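Deliverable D5.2: sample structural annotation.
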Amino acid sequence: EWVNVGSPSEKTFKQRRTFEQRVEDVRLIREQHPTKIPVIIERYKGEKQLPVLDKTKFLVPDHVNMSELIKIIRRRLQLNANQAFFLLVNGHSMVSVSTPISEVYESEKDEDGFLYMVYASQET
């Protein structure tokens, strides 16, 4: 019954900005890119295998699907084709990957309007 306190260095994009900052951010870009889906992608906390991604915020054309997106992040991470890789949403991978991101948004988006993803070598 012992709170494990995290290093304040370890904090996610969400943990670093305020709710109203986040809600505001979203409304701003959606006014400028109403055809795009704003996505936050970060390395899973406990993960040594895969590297840290240079950029973290992504505007995804609202037609693009999980299969394409996955492809895109692998390339951005410069993985070899034999590395295992998962993009996770609300902690779990995506079953339909021909489903376009705008559908996924509406079901999985966050209270603050962002869509949060996380990547790993294992599927949990």
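Annotation notes: Strands lie at 36-43, 57-61, 86-89, 115-120. The CA atoms of residues 92 and 124 lie 7 Å apart.
The annotation will be released with the project's public dataset once the embargo ends.
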